[PDB]
Design a protein around this nucleic acid. Structure first.
Ligand SMILES: [Mg+2]
Lengths: 207, 213, 90, 59, 89, 227, 250, 180, 255
RNA sequence: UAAAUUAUGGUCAAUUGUUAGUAUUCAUAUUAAUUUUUUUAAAUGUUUUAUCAUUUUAUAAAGGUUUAUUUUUGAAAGAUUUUUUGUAUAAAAUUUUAGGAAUAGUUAAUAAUAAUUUAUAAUUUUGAUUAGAUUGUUUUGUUAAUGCUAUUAGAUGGGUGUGGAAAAAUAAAAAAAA
């Protein structure tokens, strides 16, 4: 069940690419013009361009150039977090990029939430940070997550994250915050300089 | 190992011997050019195509086949691979390094090897172009390589030749010397056919002299 | 298995007998040791020819020699008086 | 196994994968022009659930 | 061929063969027992192969020695006849 | 060649073995050299239906219209995490959850500690690419108390079958360098109390009674009647 | 086997030649290639005297002879000094510094490693400084015996090599004589006064009980890749002989 | 190593190699059927004569009465005869020196002839395939074990030179006094 | 496309390299035709091999066939020298004087301490061996190289009187180097090849005149005909021509 | 320029057609074969594996060749191990047609030359080159016999050139890693 004799030797160990026979017979006139038309259809170049001499995959430079020139969704970012999503995609989602984000970047992204849409975007970015990049969390990531959820009004997301934080990867959950979020305590943190017990709806008692 | 030292000792004592009228030229024949098989195979100066059961008198070698190893970046379909080429020159017994360089640049017969000035080195030590092989004690088994002007920075991608697989080749670049020989445009006959090997030919890692698994 | 089998084999009287198909190989050389019925150089069959003829490879070649001493005149009495029949002697 | 490997048109039935080559494989000559760019001014509209929960928060 | 048990690991892949090449630990153990019987026969087979080679080598040595003796006698006779004929010539 | 199994006997085609020698049979192809392998298809066949409980948002789908409720997004993240973990665990997933990327820890597979087999790897370094489940790892492979002198790149660092037990003492900070484990034979003097050998070069485990009974039942020497 | 001359393809075109092995100092594979040679050289120096390995001071060579004499030169110094006309690079790569783990643990803890590059970029000086005395014994006649680092305390080793060269470029093959140490024999030697303390025994003690048996064997529960004898893999996939089967699941 | 494999008649390790002894015979009416033990390569072309290292001999798979022998009252000697003509020297040369292979039918025929042990194919359904245990094998090995010197001597006699020269032959061969 | 796909001239395989390193480890690249160029084409002629002990000390005397200045070869080489000087003026020091041309039959080193007794025996042997041979005729044509092109000489093809000449020179070697001990550069049982030296690079001139005579100087005259010359005298001479402007006379036999 | 004999040796040579003045092997016999009385298919799923791959699986008829078809041990056999030793592409001879004349990227030297080197080049009436015919040097039939008359299956250009070797695009009487 070896294709080394069915196809040219240069295209061995090729998986995922569909119809390698197209690249085997690409030297024909009609196949060559079809390939040229397809590359022009994908665009990104001015001259009539074709695939290299013997390659069943697109060149890395051409693929990266087309990826960068690709029109991106969300043209108009309203909030600073909306702009931060664009710049994060620019830096840590470039084609063939070896860079990996940091929990400092995650905290900066999460601290810019103002709208519930901003909260949804930040939560999705956190989830992809922990699933795709698999980045270990810091001590205060859950603190900033709780602050964001409280100041955006999402109690249920905080409770859902608390109930099974271990699948979420939150290796540090404070006893004060767990008691507050499990319906046993009315406050979760105190301001050092202000000496008041957050949230404000609880501060209305102590004052 | 043992052959070189015993041959040197035998030659030394043969030179030291004084009671010898000399070998008979008629009795000692030379190598023949005609023999069976459709291949012209050259052997050592002490070997003959015919069966010679007697060991002839040792002789001083007046023509050493110096073999110089050049780097060569052949174009494989997967990518550029750096390999080794050997250029063999026939230099006299007392040829200086200057004439050795002349011989190697006249017998390289490769467009890429002699592109720029280079210096001959042995085991990493450069050779002085003023003294001859007598000072260095160079024999036919000596391993000599060459270092070019820009081989000390070949690790840089800019110095490395740019393959069309990962790098973009411009309209000005297709008019350059190597990239004109290479053809990025797949012709119907595919005139520039090169050696091809799969990306997974050596596995997940490249070729190495050690084990990484 | 080998030890039990050889111990069993050594206990049988019918064994320890020569087995020509096993203890030796008769002739390993390709060519035979004597011609047998193959056509002669003249084209004659084996039945029409006998060995030892001119086609066989050649056998090859002051005083008195060593074979002169044993020869004696029949007039002189024989060394050993074997009673030969007169008819056979003639 | 044999049913899965039959349709790949293996002459010797050697458990190989040789997908058939269609006459029209690329979309451009299959009959479609450039891929339609999505309406950005429509996809940028905030979703109805988002508006509802925004109003709920404002409550 | 190589036997593939029904109770083996099912490759949950539609793009390839429906069964894997692995096996149950019991299957590995029972395979070793079967392979042990294969070694019992082949070891006798290999030993018989070597002794047959030795016998053939010895027979070749003896027969070749005899043939060399006879051939040398014949060629000496031929050369003697040739030199006698040369003297007569 | 190098490893003529049962000598050069060629009684059957299977007498030579499935593979003739550990070295590649053809000089051209180096990859065909004999090496330990694990089932790639089974280990990478991650559970697909387990993600059918809740929808998953695509990375390139960033438009506002396709955004979902944050609770649903968190549910999707949990589903993706459990989907990754369902088939098993790889050292790239254990390293981020262990301090100092788990340097100096002992990693072993499930089949590496079953039966007389006993092998593990002492982690020395891990390089992470963009993906958190990909990259490379290097360490010292230890087999029955004998360890490699130089670090080697681990094989199959991506397949979800790895296990590791976290110990703080063996953790090595980035300031230091992971030390190779001592060899039970040469480096540290042998002691049965500290370590006892499970299999020696001429050892082979006795036949278990359950396997013996199953083989006899299969061969039919033992009586068997259907219920 | 490979015993054929090239006649199928022209000599000018290298059609199936193996790639030449090249070591780059921008990659950790350089440390991978060089570290075991370093530890072997240190062991040889500690066991037997080695010429040209001890360095009183940094060698001074003119520029013209710099590429002629420096390459292949390896020695050691007592002080932590660096040659001039070299830009310094510190090893901040954990993968790069991982390869010196055996040297640090078994032989001598390494304090730092630095790569020095000249202004002309035609050389590489690997300078590795070890802090602390050698863990292994040092003979009084050895080269390291003249080094004050053994018995500041840290001592460094300098190695010069041309960049972008085959692994044979460094002349570390000659430093492989396996001179043994006399650590156990020195105890019984005449100079040491433990000869009377040591008590030899000629007869083995009598055995009263058999050795404790191995624990109960449990067959593996996971699936198996197959027999190693047939698959031609080494017992544990690491070392051993294919014919001699051991250390596997059975 | 072919683009389209001849699926009907495949082989192993390609052609041409591993000479193997088989039993070739044209498919005719059974009453006129007779095979030919012969050594040939693993791969054969349309005509078998292309790859024919040596010819071993005919075999007639027809039990026949011994008409050549006189009518004897011996019961065993009056059983049917299955005549087979085989070569010994060439068979030994190809088996040992060249290390050829054999198929099951020639192996069974040679086992009947006494040249080879019984083939793995022929087995009695009455006796099942046994199993082995390391402890019992070690116990038997300790119970009986041959001496290393004698085992080395017998191995040398079986494998290396066996026709040795004793002191009587050496004394006979040694030169006579006049040339001493 | 011009001819055969693989020319016969390019099917060269080198056995000086290891067997298994040319296929994969490396590829040797060189022009192998230069070393296989035949001696006939390159002008090399196999001179008698001198033993190491006799190859150190410089020669003292040499046998030559004395010829009158009027002989045809002298003017043929004169015209050759004229052509060479007209074509290139830098080979004049390499070219020898036309009056210093002789046909050498043997070279030897007589020590100066005991030269007086040896020269009498040599001259009497020459007289007694040439008292019977009639004057010889030799046809000179062709060019050759000795000492790796250091010495350029006119070849002497076999012809009439050449067999008598070689028999006479063998007898001379037997009667000079055989019975009495004199250092002959070659072997007494070997025959010296006669030649007349037209060009030669001195060891002192080796510093600036290159290492060998380039072949283009005499390529056109490599097979030139220099004609038939009759020799009727022999002379044992010494390397001293400057003082008298002629060959030094040490022994002479009017053949 | 002498006979034979210690006597058949050394192992089978044997011809058959009833015509038709004569000349010349030519109607009708015998053997061998074809022909009537209805004898007479070339099978469809090769297999294993580490899974979108890799490993093993090398001469069927197609194309019309007479100065012509020639080569490997690098896979396998193959063995304590490492290691080692060698090759080989080239030849020679036999070559058809009733009425018989020119043939050509061409010969040699040189060389890892020359679409553009040097030379009085090479093939052929001792039958060439194109064209027609036919798969080449162990096969039959007939006869007492130097003859006459038959024979088969398969090597038909390259063009990312994998492989040890292209023989690589349906065609078994080939058991192909338990
Ligand atoms: Mg024709």
């Amino acid at each position: 069940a070896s294709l080394r004799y069915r196809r040219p030797y240069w295209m061995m160990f090729l998986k995922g690419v569909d119809n390698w026979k197209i690249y085997t017979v690409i030297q024909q006139p009609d196949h060559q013009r079809t390939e040229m038309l397809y590359q022009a259809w994908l665009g990104g170049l001015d001259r009539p361009y074709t695939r290299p001499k013997c390659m069943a995959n697109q060149p890395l430079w051409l693929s990266k150039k087309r990826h960068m020139l690709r029109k991106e969704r969300l043209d108009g970012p309203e909030t600073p977090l909306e702009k931060y999503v664009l710049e994060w995609h620019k830096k840590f989602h470039s084609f063939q990029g070896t860079e990996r984000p940091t929990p400092d970047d995650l905290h900066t992204a999460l601290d810019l939430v103002e709208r519930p849409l901003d909260l949804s975007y930040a939560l999705q970015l956190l989830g992809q940070c922990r699933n795709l990049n698999n980045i270990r969390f810091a001590k205060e990531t859950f603190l900033v997550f709780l602050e964001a959820c409280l100041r955006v009004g999402r109690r249920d997301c905080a409770e859902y994250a608390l109930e099974h934080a271990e699948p979420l990867g939150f290796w540090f959950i404070d006893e004060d915050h767990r008691r507050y979020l499990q319906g046993e305590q009315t406050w979760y943190k105190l301001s050092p300089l202000d000496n008041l017990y957050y949230p404000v709806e609880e501060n209305a008692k102590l004052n | 190992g043992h052959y070189q030292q015993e041959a040197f000792e035998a030659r030394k004592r043969f030179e030291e011997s004084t009671t010898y009228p000399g070998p008979i030229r008629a009795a000692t024949p030379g190598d023949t050019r005609f023999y069976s098989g459709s291949l012209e195979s050259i052997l050592h100066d002490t070997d003959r195509h015919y069966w010679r059961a007697v060991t002839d008198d040792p002789r001083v070698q007046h023509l050493i086949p110096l073999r110089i190893r050049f780097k060569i970046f052949t174009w494989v379909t997967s990518g550029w691979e750096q390999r080794m080429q050997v250029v063999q020159i026939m230099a006299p017994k007392d040829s200086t390094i200057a004439q050795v360089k002349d011989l190697v640049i006249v017998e390289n017969q490769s467009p890429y090897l002699c592109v720029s000035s280079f210096h001959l080195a042995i085991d990493g030590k450069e050779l002085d172009p003023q003294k001859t092989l007598g000072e260095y004690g160079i024999t036919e088994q000596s391993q000599i390589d060459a270092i070019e002007q820009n081989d000390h920075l070949l690790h840089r991608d800019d110095e490395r030749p740019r393959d069309w697989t990962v790098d973009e080749i411009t309209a000005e670049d297709v008019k350059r010397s190597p990239y004109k020989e290479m053809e990025m445009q797949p012709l119907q006959n595919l005139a520039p056919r090169y050696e091809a090997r799969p990306k997974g030919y050596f596995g997940r890692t490249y070729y190495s002299g050690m084990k990484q698994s | 298995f080998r030890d039990v089998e050889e111990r069993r084999h050594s206990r049988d009287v019918v064994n320890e007998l020569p087995n020509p198909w096993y203890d030796y190989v008769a002739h390993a050389l390709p060519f035979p040791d004597r011609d047998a019925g193959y056509p002669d150089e003249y084209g004659d069959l084996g039945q029409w020819r006998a060995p030892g003829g001119p086609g066989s490879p050649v056998r090859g070649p002051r005083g008195y020699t060593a074979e002169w001493r044993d020869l004696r005149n029949p007039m002189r009495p024989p060394e050993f008086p074997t009673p030969w029949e007169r008819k056979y002697r003639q | 196994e044999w049913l899965y490997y039959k349709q790949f048109k293996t002459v010797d039935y050697s458990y190989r994968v040789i997908p058939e080559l269609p006459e029209k494989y690329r979309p451009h000559q299959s009959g479609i022009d450039q891929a339609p760019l999505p309406d950005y001014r429509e996809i940028n509209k905030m979703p109805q659930w988002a508006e509802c929960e925004e109003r709920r928060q404002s409550k | 061929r190589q036997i593939r048990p029904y109770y083996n690991l099912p490759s949950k892949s539609e793009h390839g063969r429906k069964m894997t090449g692995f096996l149950t630990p019991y299957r590995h153990w029972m395979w070793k027992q079967n392979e042990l019987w294969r070694n019992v026969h082949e070891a006798q087979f290999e030993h018989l192969r070597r002794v047959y080679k030795r016998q053939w080598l010895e027979s070749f040595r003896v027969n070749a020695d005899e043939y060399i003796y006879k051939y040398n006698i014949t060629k000496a006779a031929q050369l003697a006849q040739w030199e006698c004929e040369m003297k007569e010539q | 060649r190098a490893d003529p199994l049962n000598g050069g006997s060629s009684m059957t085609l299977g007498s030579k073995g499935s593979k003739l020698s550990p070295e590649p049979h053809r000089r051209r192809m180096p990859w065909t050299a004999a090496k330990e392998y694990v089932p790639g298809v089974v280990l990478n066949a991650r559970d697909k239906m387990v993600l059918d409980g809740v929808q998953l948002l695509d990375i390139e789908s960033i438009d506002r219209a396709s955004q979902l409720d944050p609770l649903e997004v968190l549910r999707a993240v949990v589903a993706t995490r459990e989907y990754n973990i369902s088939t098993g665990k790889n050292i790239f997933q254990l390293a981020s959850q262990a301090t100092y990327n788990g340097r100096g820890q002992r990693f072993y597979r499930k089949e590496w500690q079953e039966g007389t087999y006993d092998k593990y790897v002492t982690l020395s370094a891990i390089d992470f690419d963009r993906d958190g489940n990909k990259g490379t790892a290097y360490g010292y492979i230890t087999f029955h108390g004998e360890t490699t002198t130089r670090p080697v790149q681990v094989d199959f660092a991506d397949v979800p079958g790895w296990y590791m037990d976290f110990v703080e003492e063996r953790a090595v900070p980035f300031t230091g360098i992971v030390p190779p484990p001592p060899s039970i034979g040469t480096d540290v003097p042998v002691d049965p109390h500290s370590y006892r050998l499970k299999a020696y070069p001429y050892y082979d485990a006795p036949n278990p009674p359950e396997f013996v009974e199953r083989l006899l039942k299969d061969r039919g020497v033992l009586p068997d009647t259907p219920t | 086997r490979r015993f054929r001359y090239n006649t199928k393809f022209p000599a000018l075109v290298s059609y199936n030649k193996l790639p030449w092995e090249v070591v780059n100092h921008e990659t950790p594979q350089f440390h991978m290639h060089v570290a075991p040679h370093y530890e072997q050289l240190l062991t040889l120096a500690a066991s037997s005297p080695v010429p040209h390995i001890i360095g009183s001071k940094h060698i001074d060579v003119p520029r013209e002879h710099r590429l002629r004499l420096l390459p292949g030169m390896l020695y050691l110094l007592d002080g932590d000094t660096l040659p001039g006309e070299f830009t310094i690079n510190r090893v901040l790569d954990p993968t790069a510094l991982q390869y010196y783990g055996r040297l640090s643990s078994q032989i001598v803890t390494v304090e730092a490693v630095r790569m020095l590059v000249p202004d002309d970029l035609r050389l590489l000086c690997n300078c590795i400084t070890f802090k602390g005395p050698l863990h292994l014994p040092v003979a009084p006649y050895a080269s390291l015996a003249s080094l004050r680092g053994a018995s500041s305390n840290c001592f460094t080793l300098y190695h010069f090599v041309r960049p972008n060269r085959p692994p044979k470029e460094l002349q570390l093959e000659k430093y492989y004589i396996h001179a043994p140490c006399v650590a156990p024999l020195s105890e019984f030697a005449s100079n040491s006064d433990e000869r009377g303390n040591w008590r030899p025994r000629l007869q083995a003690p009598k055995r009263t009980r058999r050795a404790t048996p191995l624990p109960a064997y449990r067959p593996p529960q996971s699936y198996l890749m197959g027999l190693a004898e047939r698959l031609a893999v080494v017992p544990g996939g690491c070392f051993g002989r294919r014919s001699l089967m051991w250390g596997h699941w059975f | 190593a072919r683009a389209v494999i001849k699926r009907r008649s495949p082989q192993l390790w390609g052609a041409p190699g591993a000479p193997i002894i088989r039993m070739r015979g044209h498919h005719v009416v059974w009453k006129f059927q007779s095979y030919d033990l012969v050594v040939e390569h693993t791969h054969k072309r349309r005509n078998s004569d292309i790859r024919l290292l040596h010819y071993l001999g005919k075999h007639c798979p027809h039990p026949q009465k011994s008409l050549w022998s006189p009518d004897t009252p011996v019961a065993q000697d009056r059983h049917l005869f299955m005549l087979t003509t085989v070569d010994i020297d060439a068979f030994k040369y190809w088996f040992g020196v060249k290390r050829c292979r054999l198929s099951m039918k020639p192996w069974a025929l040679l086992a009947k002839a006494g040249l080879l042990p019984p083939s793995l194919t022929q087995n009695s359904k009455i006796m099942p395939k046994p199993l082995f245990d390391k402890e019992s094998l070690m116990r038997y090995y300790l119970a009986n074990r041959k001496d290393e010197d004698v085992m080395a001597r017998e191995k040398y006699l079986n494998y290396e030179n066996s026709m040795v020269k004793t002191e009587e032959e050496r004394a006979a061969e040694r030169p006579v006094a006049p040339y001493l | 496309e011009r001819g055969l796909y693989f020319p016969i001239n390019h099917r060269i395989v080198d056995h000086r390299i290891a067997p298994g390193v040319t296929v994969e480890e490396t590829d040797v690249q060189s022009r192998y035709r230069r070393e296989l160029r035949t001696n006939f084409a390159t002008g090399e002629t196999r001179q008698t091999i001198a033993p190491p002990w006799s190859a150190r000390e410089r020669p003292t005397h040499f046998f030559s066939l004395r010829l009158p200045s009027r002989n045809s070869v002298t003017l043929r080489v004169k015209e050759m020298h004229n052509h060479l000087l007209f074509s290139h003026q830098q080979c004049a020091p390499m070219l020898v004087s036309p009056t210093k041309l002789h046909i050498t039959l043997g070279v030897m080193t007589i020590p100066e301490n005991s030269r007086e007794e040896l020269v009498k025996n040599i001259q009497q042997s020459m007289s007694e061996t040439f008292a019977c041979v009639q004057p010889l005729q030799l046809r000179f044509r062709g060019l050759g190289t000795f000492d790796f092109g250091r010495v350029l000489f006119i070849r002497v093809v076999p012809e009439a009187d050449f067999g008598r000449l070689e028999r006479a020179v063998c007898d001379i070697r037997r009667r000079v180097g055989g019975v009495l001990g004199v250092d002959l550069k070659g072997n007494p049982h070997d025959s010296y090849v006669p030649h007349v030296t037209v060009a030669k690079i001195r060891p002192n001139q080796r510093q600036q005149l290159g290492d060998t005579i380039p072949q283009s100087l005499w390529a056109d005259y490599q097979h030139h005909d220099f004609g038939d010359v009759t020799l009727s005298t022999v002379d044992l001479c010494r390397m001293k021509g400057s003082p008298d402007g002629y060959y030094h006379t040490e022994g002479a036999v009017h053949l």
